[PDB]
Design a protein around this ligand. Structure first.
Ligand SMILES: [Ca+2]
Ligand SMILES: [Ca+2]
Lengths: 59, 144
């Protein structure tokens, strides 16, 4: 599931925190690297964070 | 030492708006994440807005405060610290205001605003859960 960075089966604020930590350079343990590229453009960056925020805000 | 997320108690008549405070209390460990769901009777009330108290909630220009009102009868609030260190909630206070319209058809009496105990998340800046609990509120529909 794209945006489920901790693979706990839901997309919520915990996933936002994990995306922010990854984009801040943190080694985030338990991170699903496959869930990071939410918009599928090959890169993990602030646009994926924005798409994650939109999922939490609107889904 | 259980941190509490509490929804307030207000009254009003049909056609008016009411502002319901959501309060955090018994803060000890500084809070970096809050996820909460509040249910309400959509036949009686329409959510107009959910507004953060920016005295307590900082960095709202960078999505520290995310509101989901996509589904009638449920409000999901997500508080975060986008800086991961500088803006935790470390004191008690009002987190937000729920702005409801009392629908024209609303009948009189009490109507609960219920926090889902199962989906309540409160965590510190180190991502560890903080012992937490919720307290429900209500809107009483009255005459004018
Ligand atoms: Ca998740
Ligand atoms: Ca991407």
């Amino acid at each position: 599931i794209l945006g489920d960075l901790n693979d706990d089966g839901v997309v919520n604020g915990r996933d936002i925190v994990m995306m922010r930590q990854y984009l801040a350079g943190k080694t985030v343990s338990g991170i699903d690297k496959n869930a990071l590229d939410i918009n599928g453009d090959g890169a993990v960056n602030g646009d994926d964070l924005m798409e994650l925020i939109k999922k939490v805000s609107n889904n | 030492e259980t941190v509490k997320l509490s929804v307030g108690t207000v009254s009003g008549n049909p056609g008016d708006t009411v502002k319901v405070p959501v309060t955090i209390s018994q803060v000890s460990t500084p809070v970096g994440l809050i996820c909460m769901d509040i249910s309400y009777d959509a036949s009686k009330f329409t959510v107009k807005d959910v507004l953060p108290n920016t005295d307590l909630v900082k960095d709202t220009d960078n999505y520290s405060f995310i509101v989901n009102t996509s589904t009638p009868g449920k409000i999901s609030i997500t508080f975060t610290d986008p800086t991961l260190a500088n803006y935790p909630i470390s004191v008690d206070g009002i987190l937000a205001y729920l702005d409801f319209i009392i629908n024209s058809n609303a009948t009189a009496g009490d109507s609960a605003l219920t926090v889902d105990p199962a989906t309540l998340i409160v965590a510190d800046e180190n991502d560890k859960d903080i012992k937490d609990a919720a307290s429900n509120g209500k809107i009483t529909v009255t005459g004018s």
